[PDB]
């Protein structure tokens, strides 16, 4: 998978506190480029990366209209889900949706996605064929029958194979200086004694893009999978990401440990020692 485009919607009911909030964000790879929040003073689809800003009024109006229509539909879907699960109108619930396309180096569709969750649990997903559905429970089977009857998968397929890929390719061109640039990690090892008998070696990766990275510690060339503390990859706030991996080592054995770093921006994997 060379590149992806994803849209993520979250629709959150809040009985007694007005209509369900609807927030949408769009990404190319690990770069956000639009968002919409039904709670904003003036809700519209709004730019979040500089390469999208050049799109004209017709683009922004069309995306805004879509997000408004989508907020209305997901408010109805929250009402329907309540009936499908025998639930009360007093509780707050959430529907999430993800969809998008992955394209290879030559820009052709690698695969399409459209998945839904209710209260954080899988609800229904368009299969990789872009033709059939997988429903997680007997409620989602109801939706599946409706969507089968209405040939919904066909509409998603036409989007995923058409506009999704064509607009992704456009964005990748317009944003080529950043979207098509990998920044390799700046790496180092730090050493933190914990007692006379043990020390922590922490292998750092900083300032990298995209987020995907592998950090692994070996002792005498053997992966320390079960003994490595890995933190979740985290945003630095300047588009780049950070991660570390740490091992507790016997004092005097630090040189038996090597940190290994793989990232798309590196011509070859890195090996660090303290």
């Amino acid at each position: 998978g060379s590149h992806s485009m994803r849209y993520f919607y979250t629709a959150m009911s809040r009985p007694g506190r007005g209509e369900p909030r609807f927030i949408a964000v769009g990404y190319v790879d690990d770069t956000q480029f639009v968002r919409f929040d039904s709670d904003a003073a003036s809700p519209r689809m709004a730019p979040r990366a500089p390469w999208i800003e050049q799109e004209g009024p017709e683009y922004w109006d069309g995306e805004t209209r879509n997000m408004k229509a989508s907020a209305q539909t997901y408010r109805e879907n929250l009402r329907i889900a309540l009936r499908y699960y025998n639930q009360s109108e007093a509780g707050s619930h959430i529907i999430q949706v993800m969809y998008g396309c992955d394209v290879g180096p030559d820009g052709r569709l690698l695969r399409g996605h459209d998945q839904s969750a209710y209260d954080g649990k899988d609800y229904i997903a368009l299969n990789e064929d872009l033709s059939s559905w997988t429903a997680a429970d007997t409620a989602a089977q109801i939706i599946q029958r409706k969507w089968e009857a209405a040939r919904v998968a066909e509409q998603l397929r036409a989007y995923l194979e058409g506009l999704c890929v064509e607009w992704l390719r456009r964005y990748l061109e317009n944003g080529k200086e950043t979207l098509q640039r990998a920044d390799p990690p700046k790496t180092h090892v730090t050493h933190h004694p914990i007692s006379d008998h043990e020390a922590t070696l922490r292998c750092w990766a900083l300032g990298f893009y995209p987020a995907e990275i592998t950090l692994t510690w070996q002792r005498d060339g053997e992966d320390q999978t079960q003994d490595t503390e890995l933190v979740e990859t985290r945003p630095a706030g300047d588009r780049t990401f950070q991660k570390w991996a740490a091992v507790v080592v016997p004092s005097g054995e630090e040189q038996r440990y090597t940190c290994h770093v793989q990232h798309e921006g590196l011509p070859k994997p890195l090996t660090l020692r303290w």
């Binding site: 683009y59 995306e63 109805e76």
Partner: peptide, 11 residues
């Protein structure tokens, strides 16, 4: 560009 069907699918 987001998915923008004639009729947005309902559950």
């Amino acid at each position: 560009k987001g998915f923008n069907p004639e009729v947005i699918p309902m559950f």
